[PDB]
Symmetry: C2
Subunit: 341 residues, 2 copies
């Protein structure tokens, strides 16, 4: 799936940048704004793994009768993959400002760069706008055009709703473990992460392939949101117990008063002595006050609970594919399941 | 035009809020996010003059054979007027954060409210998203639907480009009067202000009326961007010389190193002794260092130059209406000209 197509996907980026910075090279006056847009694109859409954009391309190839896969159709697939990556970039540039993060993908967040600061708010908005310029440039005469506009807009709105929910639930600075519930956790994950990361890219490829039916989309969505829930739970687990030289990351969830899967589980599993030890330790600078939490999680066998959850979640996802994939090829879904499990 | 329709326009807001906060009252889990959205709407879309949203409604009535003006068509007109107002609210909430403003419409900027801060970035994004939820809810089955989606997206992109240009030109903190040129001034005004404030609302009403032709839109646009340039120049003039009890405002353009029409004119009109006095005084806290600028503007008869510019600009706009209005009724344009002149 992914290895093969990546090459061609990253290489199409240069052309994405050309087209977005040259439709107004017949408008001299905005030159300097266009140069800034170029810099925003290059700094922020490049450097991740591209899993979500690639999924568009892979899914497209599995879905479209190979007969209808000319140079032009593939180019639209790469472009729409890149749109998912721009949606992503928009969210991250903006979330980094909202969180006051320092780095992203191990480099300095865009807004932290000397001379950028809160101007990054407009930069993020430009990234979002670039999605719709690409659709128009590449897809306006296709019959799925309006379907794709609506899917991207809807994906943005769900992501934003999810973000609002996260922000209400989990202010960086206010412990109130009372709001860290399971129903709320699943909610945040579904809106903030699973819709754009898992439904968006397959749905887009579905539409490019003519599969516009509400039912098919409802069916695919059911499988994909469930995958997205697992992916994020695995992210929360690995934030703390992952090997840091394996993730390339080192987690700060507990420091940041995150509504992690772990703390939800913890709060289901605690006697009151534990809750206090959690109330008094969740989310401080102090390393040893974080130690007390990682230790308490271990004392409640959350690694084992996770291991059990992952086995169950994998059988459950497989039954969902059995049940809801048709008439799409199960491979569209199984390729993603292999990637995350 | 405006007096009559305002009543019904402001009153439709309640229903706009209902619809946007009730499509997910069948989704309990996001309840708290929806309540926050309600608060964001009420605080930020209400309290201005509504001139741009109203223009949609007025233009619509002048453009549509009265025969096709049923309850449902008018309701769509009010809704699309409200969309222009949401686009506006989105821009202002975000610009206020980028500028570090304190107040807006004489009340505390949204991001300055205790508990909001940089979460306002997501709030602004929700306001933007609300535009497309309204179009979908109210207009998805109309034949102009995709035309309106594209117009709002394009209006956002132009506004953002304009903002970027402004931000590059005029950093709050770096005097470099070398970048304050006429061509650059007109550019910022056109992209950042005139397109969404003047072309957007009439264009939208044009599409709702079936007038989708590129030529008609090109013609209308030519008149409306020229009006937008005057409106902003008049804004820059009045920022400094307006009667404050008449504007309800009191201008800080010079303090903020703005690329005002005034400083552009000034720089065309200065001997070097003056440029230095401008280089050394443009854009400080100090009241007396601002006094020296308002005084220097008066010493170059910029009030008279403005008065001349406004006479010329009014003849020029009238000739544009003569030439480019048809086959739209000149009144669509003349009502706006009466409002701004």
């Amino acid at each position: 799936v992914y290895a093969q197509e990546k090459q061609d996907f990253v290489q199409h980026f240069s052309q994405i940048v050309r087209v977005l910075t040259e439709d107004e090279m017949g408008h001299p006056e905005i030159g300097d704004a266009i140069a800034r847009l170029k810099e925003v694109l290059e700094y922020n859409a490049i450097g991740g793994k591209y899993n979500r954009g690639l999924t568009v391309v892979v899914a497209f190839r599995e879905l479209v009768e190979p007969r209808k896969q000319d140079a032009d159709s593939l180019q639209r697939a790469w472009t729409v993959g890149w749109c998912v990556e721009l949606l992503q970039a928009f969210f991250l540039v903006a979330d980094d400002i909202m969180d006051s993060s320092l780095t992203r993908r191990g480099q300095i967040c865009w807004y932290q760069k000397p001379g950028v600061g809160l101007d990054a708010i407009n930069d993020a908005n430009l990234l979002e706008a670039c999605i719709y310029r690409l659709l128009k440039l590449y897809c306006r005469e296709q019959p799925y055009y309006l379907n794709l506009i609506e899917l991207f807009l809807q994906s943005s709105y769900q992501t934003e709703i999810g973000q609002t929910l996260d922000l209400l639930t989990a202010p960086q600075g206010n412990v109130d473990l009372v709001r860290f519930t399971e129903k709320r956790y699943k909610s945040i994950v579904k809106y903030k992460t699973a819709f754009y990361s898992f439904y968006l890219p397959i749905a887009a490829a579905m539409y490019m392939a003519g599969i516009d039916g509400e039912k098919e989309h409802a069916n695919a969505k059911k499988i994909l949101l469930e995958m997205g829930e697992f992916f994020q739970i695995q992210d929360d687990y690995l934030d703390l117990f992952g090997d840091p030289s394996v993730t390339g990351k080192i987690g700060t969830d507990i420091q940041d008063n995150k509504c992690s899967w772990l703390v939800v589980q913890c709060l289901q599993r605690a006697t009151p002595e534990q809750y206090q030890i959690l109330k008094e330790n969740y989310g401080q600078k102090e390393a040893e006050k974080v130690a007390r939490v990682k230790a308490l999680y271990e004392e409640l066998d959350l690694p084992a609970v996770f291991l059990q959850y992952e086995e169950d979640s994998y059988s459950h996802i497989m039954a969902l594919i059995e049940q809801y994939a048709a008439p799409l090829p199960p491979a569209v879904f199984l390729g993603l399941a292999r990637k995350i499990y």
